[PDB]
Design a binder for this molecule. Structure first.
Ligand SMILES: N#Cc1ccc2c(c1)CN(S(=O)(=O)c1cccs1)[C@H](Cc1ccccc1)CN2Cc1c[nH]cn1
Ligand SMILES: CC(C)=CCC/C(C)=C/CC/C(C)=C/COP(=O)(O)OP(=O)(O)O
Ligand SMILES: [Zn+2]
Lengths: 323, 407
């Protein structure tokens, strides 16, 4: 019970209670490569970890040792595995272990091993009562923590805690409407609850998005979300969309709106629309405007779409060579 | 024209590529602005110091950094003590790209070290005595193939490796990263990568894997760690690359994907971001940009007639400018972005991306684009494995002459 950062911390080779153990130095071989020059503390802890692991000593002192080994390198999955073995062998109180992992995660939230460890605990305990709140705290420090959102989806799905997520999503979108992780969480909650086939729901969503797009014309998340929820059924399936977007170019324009226009035209041409050729040319001029002025960083992409659209929608596209 | 600026990022029009926050401030715009402001300083430095820009890849400097690290690292790498094979791979591959020979003293020491990392039951661990794990296993196999000598090849225990891969296989087609560990798209790729190179791919090993990967593609066009997660460059590369190995690229909606990755290149900075509305990062010069070669190959496989014949579908020049001007540490090694400290991971991937952005290849067609001085040109890299295209062929050709464990 002596923190790795305690001022009175003592190396393991200097601890009475560990006198019986011979540390097992690391087998790096005769002439090492990518050899890390560990600090005295690090090498000391791992020399003893190697010993306990080797003897597969399932003891209370081994358990405490893993805490130090983990703190020195939370990414050492071999140590996490041994710790889980000890948690079961020693019948350790898992809520106390839950207390421990939330502290570690708060400290190193961008580590794979700490989140996986917490998931295992939640599973063992079959108790998700603390998950949404804990994750909310992590997210409150980094609204985009990938592991946090992944854990949150798992917990919500595995335990069916859908009831308040949409509300949570609305809270974070308000805080930062540009948070792409929240737009993803939104699509996550809806897809698994009401789904987007419910016309009232889909309608609501597009209304909301367009509303957001009006407020922040250049935020790409809203735009990608809008394309995402309509692209599967087909953009041309929604005739009023086009006109409503065109009524934004005046003021609320962006290379995003132009790109959407092309998308709509592309789908239209893909479903034999009226005035096929007129639509095509409208798209080819937008592709060029984007590739040479509005969105040049993507010039290669836009020129490709330009070719594609003509390669298969020009009036001569389905006309015999000899004609 | 004399008034003309050859560098895309230094042209006056470029200023128009700065962030437009629509006068609505949130943490995302504030953060994006800070970076753009920092990158603008870098771009403008030549004009302010009154010097004519010259883009030079600091070869000798990077070689020294690599040469040394390959043998010894400070305690700054204690956090990677469970990823030593990764360190071997990233370094050996960086040298490979920089076209530096791998002394046989080194190749043999490397081989021996990886042997110590290999588990009695298959796969490699992050260090001697550590349990096996698919990530360090993918690195080990890659590192060994980069060396590509009979000694290296023989380090790999093919029967055990296969057993190991099977012990991680899940009913739904996915794989665990390691025993008692988690599941995500990375495992699919690590498995496919090592199983194909060593030719241990049985008829049922990857059954359902292509379908599981496909499930990771979301409403954004990109791929997430597990079904339902935000689209991310690293996982996307993993998913596509694995599908390419399995010849199931079509399982994905390649179009929505292509649109998603192309939108990941920053209009101002030039480099790629990992996911929508986040910051640019030099390592994505590979995970993201490396997707285009994969897509070009898939779409072409489908006979797509619109595909360019001399460029990938991303601003090659702009990516080289980002890497060259904003990602090199003067002391050697490369990095995330201006202000970040160097590390071998970013050295490996910033360089891999640079190589990809310099070399276009579609069968017979071969067009290069080398920004800055010509000496900047690197050795090409295979878009699926991220090791020399030659090492890939050589490696597979060697193991194809071995029977798939079991026959
Ligand atoms: N040298 C080095 C180094 C630096 C960072 C790092 C990785 C290695 C590899 N891993 S990681 O989980 O081992 C680390 C995260 C943070 C410090 S190491 C991370 C996940 C990973 C692991 C193995 C291969 C590829 C990716 C990635 N990162 C964090 C990162 C890179 N770019 C932006 N964030
Ligand atoms: C072969 C292999 C194992 C590939 C792995 C690919 C890869 C890079 C995965 C990392 C994704 C991730 C969880 C990023 C979180 O850090 P962050 O929030 O700092 O990332 P970001 O801001 O750049 O999105
Ligand atoms: Zn990075």
């Amino acid at each position: 019970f002596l923190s790795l950062d305690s001022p009175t911390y003592v190396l393991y080779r200097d601890r009475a209670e560990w006198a019986d153990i011979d540390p097992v130095p690391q087998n790096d071989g005769p002439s090492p490569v990518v050899q890390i020059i560990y600090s005295e503390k690090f090498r000391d802890v791992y020399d003893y970890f190697r010993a306990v692991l080797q003897r597969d000593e399932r003891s209370e002192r081994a358990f405490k040792l893993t805490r130090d080994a983990i703190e020195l390198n939370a990414a050492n999955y071999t140590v996490w595995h041994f710790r889980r073995v000890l948690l079961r062998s020693l019948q350790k109180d898992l809520q106390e272990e839950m207390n421990y992992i939330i502290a570690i995660i708060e400290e190193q939230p961008k580590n794979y091993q700490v989140w996986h460890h917490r998931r295992v605990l939640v599973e063992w305990l079959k108790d998700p009562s603390q998950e949404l709140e804990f994750i909310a705290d992590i997210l409150n420090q980094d609204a985009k923590n990938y592991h946090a959102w992944q854990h949150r989806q798992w917990v919500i799905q595995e335990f069916r805690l859908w009831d308040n997520e949409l509300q949570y999503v609305d809270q974070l979108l308000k805080e930062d409407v540009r948070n792409n992780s929240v737009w993803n969480q939104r699509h996550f909650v809806i897809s698994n609850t009401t789904g987007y086939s419910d016309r009232a729901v889909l309608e609501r969503e597009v209304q909301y998005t367009l509303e957001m797009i009006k407020l922040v014309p250049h935020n790409e998340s809203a735009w990608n979300y809008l394309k995402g929820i309509l692209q599967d059924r087909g953009l041309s399936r929604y005739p009023n969309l086009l006109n409503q977007l065109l009524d934004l170019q005046p003021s609320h324009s962006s290379p995003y709106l132009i790109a959407f226009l092309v998308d709509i035209y592309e789908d239209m041409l893909e479903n034999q629309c009226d005035n096929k050729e007129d639509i095509l040319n409208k798209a080819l001029e937008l592709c060029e405007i984007l590739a040479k002025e509005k969105d040049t960083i993507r010039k290669e992409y836009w020129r490709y779409i330009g070719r594609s659209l003509q390669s298969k929608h020009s009036r001569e596209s389905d006309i015999p060579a000899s004609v | 024209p004399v008034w003309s600026e050859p560098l895309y990022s230094l042209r006056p029009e470029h200023a128009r590529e700065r962030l437009q926050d629509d006068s609505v401030e949130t943490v995302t715009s504030i953060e994006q602005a800070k970076v753009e402001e920092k990158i603008q300083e870098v771009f403008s430095s030549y004009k302010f110091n009154h010097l004519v820009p010259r883009l030079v890849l600091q070869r000798e400097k990077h070689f020294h950094y690599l040469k040394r690290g390959l043998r010894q690292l400070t305690d700054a790498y204690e956090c990677l003590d469970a990823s030593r094979p990764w360190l071997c791979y990233w370094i050996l591959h960086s040298l490979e790209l920089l076209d530096e020979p791998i002394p046989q003293i080194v190749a043999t020491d490397v081989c021996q070290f990886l042997e110590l990392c290999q588990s009695p039951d298959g796969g490699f661990g992050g260090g001697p005595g550590q349990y096996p794990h698919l990530a360090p296993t993918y690195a080990a196999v890659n590192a060994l193939c980069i060396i590509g000598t009979e000694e290296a090849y023989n380090v790999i225990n093919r029967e055990k490796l296969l057993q190991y891969l099977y012990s991680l296989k899940q009913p739904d087609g996915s794989f665990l990263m390691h025993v008692g560990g988690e599941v995500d798209v990375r495992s699919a790729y690590c498995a496919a990568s090592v199983a194909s190179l060593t030719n241990i791919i049985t008829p049922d090993l990857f059954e359902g894997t292509a379908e599981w990967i496909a499930r990771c593609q979301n409403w954004e066009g990109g791929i997430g760690g597990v079904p339902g997660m935000e689209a991310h460059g690293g996982y996307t590369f993993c998913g596509l690359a694995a599908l390419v190995i399995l010849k199931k690229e079509r399982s994905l909606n390649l179009k929505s994907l292509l649109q998603w990755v192309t939108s990941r290149q920053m209009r101002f900075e030039g480099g790629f971001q990992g996911r929508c509305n986040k910051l640019v990062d030099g390592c994505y010069s590979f995970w993201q940009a490396g997707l285009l070669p994969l897509l070009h190959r898939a779409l072409h496989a489908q006979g797509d007639p619109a595909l360019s014949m001399s460029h990938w579908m991303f601003h090659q020049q702009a990516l080289q400018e980002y890497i060259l001007m904003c990602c090199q540490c003067p002391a050697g090694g490369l990095l995330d972005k201006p202000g970040k400290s160097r590390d071998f991971y970013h050295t490996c991937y910033c360089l891999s991306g640079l190589s990809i952005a310099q070399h276009f290849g579609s069968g017979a067609m071969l067009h290069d684009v080398v920004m800055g001085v010509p000496e900047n040109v690197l050795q090409p890299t295979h878009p699926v494995y991220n090791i020399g295209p030659d090492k890939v062929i050589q490696a597979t050709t060697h193991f194809l002459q071995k029977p798939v464990p079991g026959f």
